[PDB]
Design a binder for this molecule. Structure first.
Ligand code: CDK
Length: 295
């Protein structure tokens, strides 16, 4: 801090508070995240975070500076003016126009393609972490912070962390999950943009899993070899039949439903990569429209 002048709270992220702040030399407005340290700050968290300062991409919220003092760490991010949650709320009556949904999905997949080529995972994608600007860009925020620490189930703020976007392999207690978890979260967000309702609004871990199962079918060894040996899998899970995607995300067109199906494959190895998603036929007519943002 010290060179920074708080102007308002824009989020109680999972790791700390997030303020809009004005840099008191350069005059730049930034998003300041005070990170809430367990005792001190692990040096490995510091080296983990430092590598992020280099992971720069048009679709990743730029980390400007990391600033360390005793039991407070600060991350200084470029400031964007709105998150996708708020923009989706704002768009609730008419929905986001599909061309703009498509552009946002395409850009994010580009972001994810980049991170994953550097072996960096987000692990916690959600509409609150997807930030937009007036020029039609969308960016991944709060990014690779999960590996740097871990994610508590209860943030310092006593708001519950959302499970709505969590890949099934995480929920079934796999320890060493992959990039494919981010593809899953992004498909849940795609679906939500299209339908204007959360796809799997779980309010505990088993409600979340049983919501996935109801829509997609209870997974078995036919669709997900190895599933039945995962740490939190129980042979006593109820066996639901799969619903059709025509019912899940109307009125998404066939290309979009086919891409979404690949993003939502149970087996993280059959799940489409970000890079392969970019070549899907759904992005043959991609464009970059301007949102109607009300700031
Ligand atoms: C009433 O409005 C409250 C809803 N939040 S909001 O207004 O849409 C919003 C406004 C601005 C921002 N800006 C912003 N810019 C850069 C980074 C961030 C975030 S969001 C997040 O979780 N982190 C860690 C960061 C750095 N936020 C984020 C959210």
């Amino acid at each position: 801090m010290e060179n920074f002048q708080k102007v308002e709270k824009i989020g109680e992220g999972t790791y700390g508070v997030v303020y809009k702040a004005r840099n008191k030399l350069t005059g730049e407005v930034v998003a300041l995240k005070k990170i809430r340290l367990d005792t001190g700050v692990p040096s490995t968290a510091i080296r983990e975070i430092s590598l992020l300062k280099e992971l720069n991409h048009p679709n990743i919220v730029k980390l400007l500076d990391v600033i360390h003092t005793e039991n407070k760490l600060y991350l200084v991010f470029e400031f964007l003016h709105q998150d996708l949650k708020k923009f989706m709320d704002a768009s609730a009556l008419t929905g986001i126009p599909l061309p703009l949904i498509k552009s946002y999905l395409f850009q994010l997949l580009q972001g994810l393609a980049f991170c994953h080529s550097h072996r960096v995972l987000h692990r916690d994608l959600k509409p609150q972490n997807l930030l937009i600007n007036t020029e039609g860009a969308i960016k991944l925020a709060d990014f690779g912070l999960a590996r740097a620490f871990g994610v508590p189930v209860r943030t310092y703020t006593h708001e519950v962390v959302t499970l709505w976007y969590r890949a099934p392999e995480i929920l079934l207690g796999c320890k060493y999950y992959s990039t494919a978890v981010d593809i899953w979260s992004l498909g849940c967000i795609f679906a939500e943009m299209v339908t204007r309702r959360a796809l799997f609004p779980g309010d505990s871990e088993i409600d979340q899993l049983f919501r996935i199962f109801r829509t997609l079918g209870t997974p078995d060894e036919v669709v997900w070899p190895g599933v039945t040996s995962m740490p939190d899998y129980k042979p006593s899970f109820p066996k639901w039949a799969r619903q059709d995607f025509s019912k899940v995300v109307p009125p998404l067109d066939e290309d979009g439903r086919s891409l979404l199906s690949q993003m939502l494959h149970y087996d993280p190895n059959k799940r489409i990569s970000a890079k392969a998603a970019l070549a899907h036929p759904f992005f043959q007519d991609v464009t970059k429209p301007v949102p109607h943002l009300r700031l």
